[PDB]
């Protein structure tokens with residue numbers, strides 16, 4: 161509705177947010193134009209918006225947002241010279257014009273990777289002009305990530321602003337700042353990866369699969385909501401997810417805004433944890449509702465045995481509307497289990513489905529599916545035990561040593577993966593342990609699921625078009641519900657031919673003593689991987705012995721008079737003895 165949509169958007173978003181969003185929008189299309197050009201564009205658009213705010217009847221104010229945005233894009237002088245055929249989109253009637261612009265966004269613009277400046281430099285730039293400093297980076301990230309949901313970039317921005325504001329006036333600027341920048345950076349990459357994984361998953365596995373996932377996730381989140389409400393929400397969420405995957409900012413923003421609005425106007429039928437965020441500005445509503453903690457589930461809910469196993473109408477109810485019945489099963493199981501990963505829940509539903517498909521065709525269905533819940537136990541226990549053993553291992557080893565244990569275990573399983581990748585995945589997996597094991601058992605599986613989906617997705621992306629193992633491909637292309645267990649099922653590669661010994665690979669220098677904590681760990685874990693690759697049959701026990709000799713080697717040589725030679729000569733003996741021990 162509204163006479164002037166731009167005026168309406170300006171009034172609701174507020175000038176500052178409007179300007180930041182217009183900047184992101186333009187940067188995501190004019191990925192090659194300079195920052196100053198974008199600033200000029202934003203000011204021009206904002207000044208126009210203001211005329212509309214002052215008067216909805218002002219000239220051009222009644223044009224749609226897409227029309228106005230596309231027109232502005234087409235007034236860019238160097239459009240054809242810089243963007244080639246994208247300039248051809250201007251010859252199209254708006255509707256088709258927007259689609260054309262959308263399809264011309266470059267998800268890999270081949271721009272130089274952003275590098276973190278020195279703390280003193282960053283902080284000083286921040287101080288000299290926070291606005292420009294922040295907007296400059298907002299522009300650099302946006303143009304490198306067209307498709308990254310614009311509003312979400314605004315949330316990251318405000319978090320960076322806070323990080324710099326607090327850390328740049330602290331006693332130990334770097335100690336304060338860097339960890340925060342590391343976190344933001346990681347969350348950013350993860351969010352981007354997550355956004356792509358979800359759309360890729362929708363594409364490959366279909367809408368039904370997404371709806372199943374949605375029923376489970378929404379049910380854990382809103383356990384007190386009726387199934388019909390959850391069902392309605394899954395339909396709306398599927399639409400938002402599908403349209404947001406199409407990529408148009410406005411269409412996606414309006415869909416999310418619509419859903420958030422519906423949710424907020426129906427809190428009594430959805431959850432008691434939404435008050436604080438249903439009071440938030442339109443811009444932040446959906447984002448905040450998306451992070452709302454699970455509502456508390458209804459007290460002493462009955463077992464599902466009655467309706468899904470004991471009832472005489474099980475097969476009758478199932479056959480009449482299979483997906484609806486399975487959806488009900490999933491909703492009842494999930495609302496009761498916020499402690500399960502969504503995929504575990506999907507494996508339980510699939511198991512139930514398979515049994516009903518088999519049993520309902522039997523002469524006497526009930527006799528056949530009577531013990532279906534028994535089939536659930538082993539499925540639930542697998543992740544549960546895996547988390548127990550890993551958190552127990554982590555608690556007795558520490559993050560670093562924990563990563564190293566994973567490093568050796570995975571290298572042995574897939575020795576063909578590149579060393580840098582084995583190190584990175586192992587380290588990241590070590591962190592998920594450090595992060596999730598800090599949660600009580602009740603919240604560990606969902607945590608692991610969320611973080612592992614990131615780490616494993618990244619591994620899969622790297623393996624994609626850089627494959628080295630059919631088994632990794634299998635796990636990466638299999639159903640997302642069988643992804644993690646598939647990786648867990650990898651066995652030691654016994655066909656792996658030991659990698660020839662490379663002297664250079666096992667030669668260390670005094671510089672190792674001056675590297676940062678991170679750089680040092682990476683050098684050691686890198687050498688550890690190469691060690692396992694060269695001696696794949698070396699037992700974890702034999703490896704520890706060599707690791708201890710090495711540990712004593714670096715320590716009992718980094719701090720020992722003027723010696724840049726106790727690495728060369730003492731290293732020669734270490735390598736010689738190790739080759740013997742592992743021979």
Ligand code: HEM
Pocket residue numbers: 273274275276277282293294295297298299301305313314315316317318320344345347348349350352353
């Ligand atoms: C305006 C606020 C900012 C936002 C919204 C933002 C957002 C992001 C996002 C979403 C990513 C990950 C993208 C990916 O998937 O690769 C990222 C990465 C990164 N950001 Fe920011 N950022 C902001 C400000 C800054 C600032 C002020 C700095 C440095 C002074 C910075 C330095 C970096 C670095 C070094 C990376 C890693 C790049 C890479 O590994 O290729 N960011 N940022």
Ligand SMILES: CCCCCCCCCCCCCC(=O)O
Pocket residue numbers: 368369370371372375390391394483484486487488490506507509510513639641
């Ligand atoms: C609104 C109700 C939506 C119900 C969705 C059907 C549920 C299907 C459960 C079967 C699980 C399949 C798992 C998978 O897609 O990989």
Ligand SMILES: CCCCCCCCCCCCCC(=O)O
Pocket residue numbers: 169178181182185205225229311410413414416417418420442443444445446447
């Ligand atoms: C050049 C025109 C720029 C128009 C500004 C784009 C509108 C931003 C919509 C952001 C609202 C997000 C709400 C949500 O996620 O629920």
Ligand SMILES: CCCCCCCCCCCCCC(=O)O
Pocket residue numbers: 546550570573574577581582585589612619644647648650
């Ligand atoms: C670079 C390739 C690494 C391959 C290792 C498989 C991926 C890790 C399996 C997923 C983690 C499961 C949790 C665990 O460690 O028990």
Ligand SMILES: CCCCCCCCCCCCCC(=O)O
Pocket residue numbers: 501503504543546547550551566589590592593596605608609612644645
């Ligand atoms: C690499 C260290 C991971 C530490 C956390 C334990 C992870 C155990 C796997 C849990 C998987 C949950 C999702 C699923 O149901 O498959």
Ligand SMILES: CCCCCCCCCCCCCC(=O)O
Pocket residue numbers: 564666684685687688691706707708710711734735738739
């Ligand atoms: C061919 C023999 C090479 C012997 C040197 C092994 C180097 C591997 C370093 C292992 C790192 C262990 C972790 C640590 O001590 O911090």
